[PDB]
Amino acid sequence: SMSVKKPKRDDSKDLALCSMILTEMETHEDAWPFLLPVNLKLVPGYKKVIKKPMDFSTIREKLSSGQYPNLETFALDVRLVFDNCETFNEDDSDIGRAGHNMRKYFEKKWTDTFK
């Protein structure tokens, strides 16, 4: 509350560390569905159904331009990529499996780097 603060957690490396995680996600062999924004002109249903599209290149541009106020807003956009994927793709599809795999990969790096 006013004049009453928990001890300051060191957040000075968060930007570098989120960038490293994102690099690891960019280079994963199953990243291909997620590297670029879904082409809204060429994929029927996407525009209407997926209210907030997100992809790795969009996260990378937001990261690089100071548009994440803190490491939690970064994780929310990463998770959005996977949540969108599960909304639009059957579990038993190549893309559906890719999303599960990448979500797992991310959540481990997230815990190991920060928790």
From Swiss-Prot:
Corresponding gene?
BAZ2B
Q: Where in the cell is it found?
A: Nucleus
Q: What is the lineage of its organism?
A: Eukaryota, Metazoa, Chordata, Craniata, Vertebrata
Q: What does this protein do?
A: Regulatory subunit of the ATP-dependent BRF-1 and BRF-5 ISWI chromatin remodeling complexes, which form ordered nucleosome arrays on chromatin and facilitate access to DNA during DNA-templated processes such as DNA replication, transcription, and repair. Both complexes regulate the spacing of nucleosomes along the chromatin and have the ability to slide mononucleosomes to the center of a DNA template. The BRF-1 ISWI chromatin remodeling complex has a lower ATP hydrolysis rate than the BRF-5 ISWI chromatin remodeling complex.
Please identify the protein, giving its name as recorded. Answer: Bromodomain adjacent to zinc finger domain protein 2B
Task: Give start and end of each Bromo domain.
Answer: 9-113
Family statement: Belongs to the WAL family.
Tree of life domain = Eukaryota
User: Source species, please?
Assistant: Homo sapiens
Q: How does it assemble?
A: Component of the BRF-1 ISWI chromatin remodeling complex, at least composed of SMARCA1 and BAZ2B, which regulates the spacing of histone octamers on the DNA template to facilitate access to DNA. Within the BRF-1 ISWI chromatin remodeling complex interacts with SMARCA1; the interaction is direct. Component of the BRF-5 ISWI chromatin remodeling complex, at least composed of SMARCA5/SNF2H and BAZ2B, which regulates the spacing of histone octamers on the DNA template to facilitate access to DNA.
Expressed, tissue-wise, as follows: Expressed at varying levels in several tissues, whereas a smaller transcript was expressed specifically in testis.
